[PDB]
């Protein structure tokens, strides 16, 4: 049976997920967020560009419009 | 009388129409009566809630006219 | 009484005549207009498009959604209103 996105986001919430930005940047982060705009917030996040690891980041705030991935 | 009892997709609320020209609504969750609406000026047996509209009712009477709310 | 929709009255007057519009891709369209909405969606019947080099094409119908577009040029006749 199908599942709605909001509990699905909750199912992804707390798991380890792969993310990618439309500009071509990739990140891995832990996520806890609920808002009407469906924004995302990540903590202690690792940055990847073109498949190459760049740096370990701290907490990062990213708008919902630019992100299009959440799965683990 | 054979009152045309109605149970819309709203079925959490019960809707019925009766010869007094009044409409009564009941709540299934608490079994209470809570409805005060009226239609026509004479006894009639006709009551439907529109199955594809969110805020319209239709009523008919023996006077020869049909009225909507 | 009601007193609202002043641009809508102007938009209704622009209907039935020829309009010019440009898109985010940069090319220019020329078309006859007869459709309007409060959400700025518009539709053109019979249209000619011209590109910034030398290519041109004719189009019978174009639909425009009012919230993800560049602005359109309205006929001169509106000045009489």
């Amino acid at each position: 049976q199908p599942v709605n996105p909001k509990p699905f986001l909750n199912s992804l919430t707390g798991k380890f997920v792969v993310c990618k930005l439309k500009w071509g940047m990739e990140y891995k982060g832990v996520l806890v967020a609920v808002d009407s705009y469906m924004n995302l917030q990540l903590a202690h996040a690792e940055e990847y560009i073109d498949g190459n690891s760049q740096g370990n980041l701290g907490e990062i705030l990213i708008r919902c419009n630019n992100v299009l991935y959440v799965g683990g | 009388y054979a009152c045309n009892i109605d149970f819309s997709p709203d079925q959490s609320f019960l809707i019925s129409g009766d010869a007094d020209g009044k409409l009564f609504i009941w709540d299934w969750r608490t079994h209470k009566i809570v409805g005060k609406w009226k239609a026509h000026d004479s006894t009639c047996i006709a009551a439907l809630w529109h199955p594809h509209e969110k805020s319209r009712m239709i009523t008919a009477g023996w006077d020869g006219l049909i009225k909507m709310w | 009484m009601t007193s609202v929709g002043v641009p809508i009255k102007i938009l209704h007057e622009a209907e039935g005549h020829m309009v010019t519009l440009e898109t985010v891709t940069g090319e220019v369209y020329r078309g006859k207009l007869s459709e309007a909405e409060d959400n700025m969606n518009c539709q053109l019947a019979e249209t000619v498009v011209t590109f910034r080099d030398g290519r041109s094409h004719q189009l019978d119908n174009v639909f425009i959604r009012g919230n993800k577009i560049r602005f359109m040029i309205l006929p001169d006749m509106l000045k009489n209103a």
Binding site: P2, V3, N4, P5, F8, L9, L12, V18, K22, W23, M38, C64, N65, L68, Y69, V70, G71, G72 | - | -
Partner: protein
Amino acid sequence: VQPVNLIFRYLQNRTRVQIWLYEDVTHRLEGYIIGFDEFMNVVFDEAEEVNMKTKGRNKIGRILLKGDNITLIHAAQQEA
């Protein structure tokens, strides 16, 4: 017919569809779907991403794709 009901036709029939993305993106995803809402959001699973710079595919497990970012949806076919 409606997109949400058509999404129900894909999931009930386990259809594999390809989805394209808007704005500055050049990627194609082919995956099965199990999700519904009035905003036509898509839950993507058993997915593969094609990198048009190299035409290589990687395996992806269970991701959500926001409908506003989505362009076209159609029944997937092989590309090489």
